[model samples]
Target: MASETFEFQAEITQLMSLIINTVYSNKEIFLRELISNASDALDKIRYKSLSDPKQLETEPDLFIRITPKPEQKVLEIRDSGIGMTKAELINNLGTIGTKAFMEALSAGADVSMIGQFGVGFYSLFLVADRVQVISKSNDDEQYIWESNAGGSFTVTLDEVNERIGRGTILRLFLKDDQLEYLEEKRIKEVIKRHSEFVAYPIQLVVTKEV
Candidate 1:
């Protein structure tokens, strides 16, 4: 599959609008949300590998890598885990990009309700203009899912030669003002505060010039 585009559910427009305006008082929660998702992915892989040893053949390492390409204005969070298939990608990621889950609130929605619906994923829009998810499942080819929070998203097959053997990589195209998220100091602080208890190892990649 070279490419495909999927329009977000109708209610997502309102949902994104509301989030952009109010939901998260601390935008830093975006890092926690993404880190938590990566942790879940790693857990899934570990559980599956226990049943079928072959699941770990491609990537035996259970960990998360957070790399900040400050020059490129991108923050990449990658994990070694059981990646999603095409259908799973659509169902898991696509299905949640909406407002239907919390329709009870038209005028007043609490942050708790926001948390209940996995709206945390969409919080990337708080600091990024675009986001790209590249995932490779054991049974399926590597695929890239991209969105700009414009009420639609695109999924495409990744043709790059340097592909991840298994699991997922998320690249957030950061906004100019949000470049602080790429700083090693900031990333370490955020992970310590929210993801210190994550079972898998988290590596914050920092580049140095000689």
Candidate 2:
């Protein structure tokens, strides 16, 4: 198959902008989205490993790591979960589509349900000017997907320092007005409020001066 970058459908683009800019007024929602995504990813890997035990042999610690770099104006959310293939990254990030639950129902596929929506990922744009996602999946090479919440995005295969483990790392370039998100106390509060019940541990890493 040919490698390609796809644009979001026009309606999807508008919907994404609306959801990111308006629907999420509370900054704490960022924590909720990240944690929810991480939980979903971990659940996926666990389910897949049930059929292939070797997949879970290494990196048994499935968790989320939140690092705040106030000086750099960036926040990183990393997770050891089921990663994505290059194509999957493009599809998941570049395009807007119904959630898996809706797709399964529409296709008459039998499966337990989850909420159906396509704008959850765009929530990152609420406080970030730019976003970078690095992921490695068991079935594909490591890849990087980046965007600025515009109608376009880029996905490229990482040639060096690629993660051999299956997971994802999301780096959010926070806007100047949203720097408070870099504070340890605020981050912890967000996690406690939205992610305390998450299936995996959420670690907050903050810098300290000697």
Candidate 3:
């Protein structure tokens, strides 16, 4: 597939608008969606490793790492789970839109699974003006996927050596209004509420003021 630039299908554009504009009325849900994504990823890797033991040879511990960079106004959520290919990233992140979600809801998929809704990644828009996903999948080369909460996004194949074993990293560039996410107390509360039940360990990285 060509990597110059891609457009979201019309329906997808509408969904992106809806997600970027709404969907998350509460700030706490960001933690829920991210942690849920992490747990799902771990589950996928655990199942896949059952068939391919080689995938587990390096890092067998499944965990989520949340790192906050106050100076940069950024937050990162990293997971050692089943990663995504370039194609998978496009299909999952690019094409998942309102039409597909409405169709699934009509077909009786539970509302709780809505976060599992592929488009929930858009939830980042609730807090961030831009987001970047760096991923390394066992089946594909490492790549960086980035978007500015607009109607479009870009995916670039890795240029530098990405030491990612087999998982994903979600980096959020926060909007000025959402800077409170950098607070350790706020971040901890959010994680405990949404991610405490996650099947893997979730660690929050904080720095003390000198």
Best by lDDT: 1
Question: Residue 55, candidate 1: how far off, in angstroms?
Answer: 0.3
Please give the CA lDDT of all the candidate structures.
0.80, 0.73, 0.77
Q: Of 1 and 2, which scores higher on TM-score?
A: 1
Ranking by TM-score: 1, 3, 2
Best-matching candidate per TM-score: 1
Write the number of the candidate with greater TM-score, choosing between 2 and 3: 3
Off by over 4 Å in 2: 1-5, 96-118, 160-164
Task: Tell me the tens digit of each residue's lDDT in model 1 across 27-125.
Answer: 777788888888988998899888899999898789999999988999998999899887777766677435554474565665434545766677677
The superposed Cα distance between candidate 2 and the true structure at residue 50, in angstroms, equals 1.3
For candidate 1, what is the TM-score?
0.89
Of the candidates numbered 1 and 3, which has the greater lDDT value?
1
Residues 52-146 of candidate 3 have per-residue lDDT tens digits of 98987656778898989898999988899999999888887777435767577558654335576565666677788788888888889888887
**Alpha-carbon TM-score of each model against the true structure:** 0.89, 0.82, 0.85
Query: Scored by Cα lDDT, where does model 3 land?
Result: 0.77
lDDT for predicted candidate 1 compared with the true structure: 0.80
Error of 2 at 205 (Å): 1.2
lDDT of 3 at 50: 93
Q: Which stretches of candidate 1 lie over 4 Å from their true place?
A: 21-25, 96-113
